[PDB]
Amino acid sequence: LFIQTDKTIYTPGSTVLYRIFTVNHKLLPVGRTVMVNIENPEGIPVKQDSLSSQNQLGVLPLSWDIPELVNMGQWKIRAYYENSPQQVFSTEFEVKEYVLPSFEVIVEPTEKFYYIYNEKGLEVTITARFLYGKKVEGTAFVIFGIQDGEQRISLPESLKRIPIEDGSGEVVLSRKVLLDGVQNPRAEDLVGKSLYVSATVILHSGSDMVQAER
């Protein structure tokens, strides 16, 4: 069961439109009965339904209107065939307070890694283009941190404002900052841990702000 939701983020008071494809092991349409349960962020079902794929060619369009007073965070939609209730397929859609942004921010480092003995430091390029294909002028804040396991620690001496002209700016994290931010002076013992770049961009109009994290 391959569940497809039109959007990937919904606001409360907005309807959810999703489909439930029904295919067999050989990837062909099949006529079977499905069950669907839509879970809260905590994991308590809110809606239950039963449908048949017979004479529907393996597509079951459905709907749900999100209640106004609901919890935030990830929601889940779990669907499973009626004959085999112990195998369950799922997708996640997020309910959040948002207004659509105006431009996408892309941060791609020059190399998809950081050599530990490199004396030049991490080389990250921040680029910002409007949604419909025009370049952005603004100021971008960035920050770096060390992500080990599940705990994220940021580098206080690393946040920088690098103004972007013609929609591209470049900042470098000098290895001295990386070594001094962490409490282990042994550079070799730092291996394995992953950096993470959090870039915040604001236009010179100051009307819109967007965050992008790599």
Place this chain on the structure above:
Amino acid sequence: MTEDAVDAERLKHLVTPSGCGEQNMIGMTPTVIAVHYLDETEQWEKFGLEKRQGALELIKKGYTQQLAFRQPSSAFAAFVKRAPSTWLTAYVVKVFSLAVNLIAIDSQVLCGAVKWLILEKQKPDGVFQEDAPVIHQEMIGGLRNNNEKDMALTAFVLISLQEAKDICEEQVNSLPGSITKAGDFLEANYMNLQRSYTVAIAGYALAQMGRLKGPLLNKFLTTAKDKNRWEDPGKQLYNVEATSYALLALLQLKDFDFVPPVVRWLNEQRYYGGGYGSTQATFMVFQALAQYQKDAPDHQELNLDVSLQLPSRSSKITHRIHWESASLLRSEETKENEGFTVTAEGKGQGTLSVVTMYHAKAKDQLTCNKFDLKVTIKPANTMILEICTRYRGDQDATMSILDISMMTGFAPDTDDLKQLANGVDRYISKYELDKAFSDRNTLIIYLDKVSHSEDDCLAFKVHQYFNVELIQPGAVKVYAYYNLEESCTRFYHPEKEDGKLNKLCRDELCRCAEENCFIQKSDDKVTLEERLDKACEPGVDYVYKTRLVKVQLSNDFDEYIMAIEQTIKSGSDEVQVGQQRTFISPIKCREALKLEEKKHYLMWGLSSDFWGEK
């Protein structure tokens, strides 16, 4: 609340059929009971999937051999020439009744054997008589001993008949009468029984038909040694089989207060079967273990049916919770908060939780948290604007964005912005700096740090060039870069203290009245005819005769006690006439003119002038 069964790892030693009828029984009984136990416990995944087919083949071969060995009178014996043995026939009946599930057995053979036994093998008193003892009686269990042997044989044959009673219930109608006679005979002389094996078998025979009541249960319970088993002096195999029949009797009676100790004693006994003269005990113990499974004593008793008495009383909402729905969470949504009655019925236990969600009034929670903005403007067209910030936290602030959004037709003085950008810890984007001029009504200032102990703040001049009245109040907004939901906002207006616009609000129904109080008429046009003619415009709705009675003040407005005399021209309201009326006016309107009590006034207005609720 259950005991794990044997893993059957060491039960591999459980023999091809061979020999005569007795030897074939010796061969089949352990293998048949072992495969039945494995089927019941569903442990074939580890014992070896392949061996079951060989077991079935060998047991089928033995069954076919014994079908060939069946006497024409449906009798089973060691030899066809030898006289049939009642015990052998009963054992064959039991084996067939056990193996009908695994292999095909002719029910006609069983019915014929039952009829043959009933016809001449029993006394009218209900005593089962053995006409030919088996040649090899060393493996018949407790029946070898002659003390109370007749009662033991009676109980064994009665159990064999009753377990096959349903199979030949239609063919044989005299079986229930013989069963009742045997039970009466067994219960007549129960007190004479002394051996634990004989007592157990007699009690099982009595319980399988339904006369185990009264002091018999007390005697059986008091007969227990250490409350785990019924033992007798001699071979321990007799004790094992006696405990087996005891636990079958308990399971038939469904007495859960004694099964766990018995099964624990059996488990710690570690009887793997085999040996010499242990066929009956092994068969009984493995049949006991198999019957324990698929009827495991546990606490599955969840059949709750819960109904809700909704306050709306539209209908009755009920739902049922079963074992298959023990993890089924049903959510009920109600839009009304009122007491409702819940009824819980059925065996089992359930959980109820109710949660309500709503909006709570703010407990003096302010929008500008953890910042302190104090935006001021003052005349020096020049205006010196100075924005003073602070951080309410315990530490020095991170990088913050001091945003500015100018009014209508006001621009920053480009001379000051140069040294502001040049200064320390205040950076203004080059793009915003180079354009400037009349084109910019929006300036953004980045702060390196915001002091959390003192107030370091800036001040630069803004000019005017468009000269338009009715200026829009500006804005100032600060926020640390790491988030946007936590910020602050202040509005600066040259004349209004905070530029919040005039908003006459009562209780919580706010509305704005951005207009003049009245016309500043100096009575220059004494010709009231023109005013009367102009008053007939569509923008005029009601004209009233009013006389002020009392004058009162309030927080941000002043109220006057009107005395209506007559409604000159409609009003889209009740005329009333002669009752006190209240007029709500802005507090600024007192300066423009103050109404005098006990004076006649003329006023005309439109529909929106009547504000409030009737």
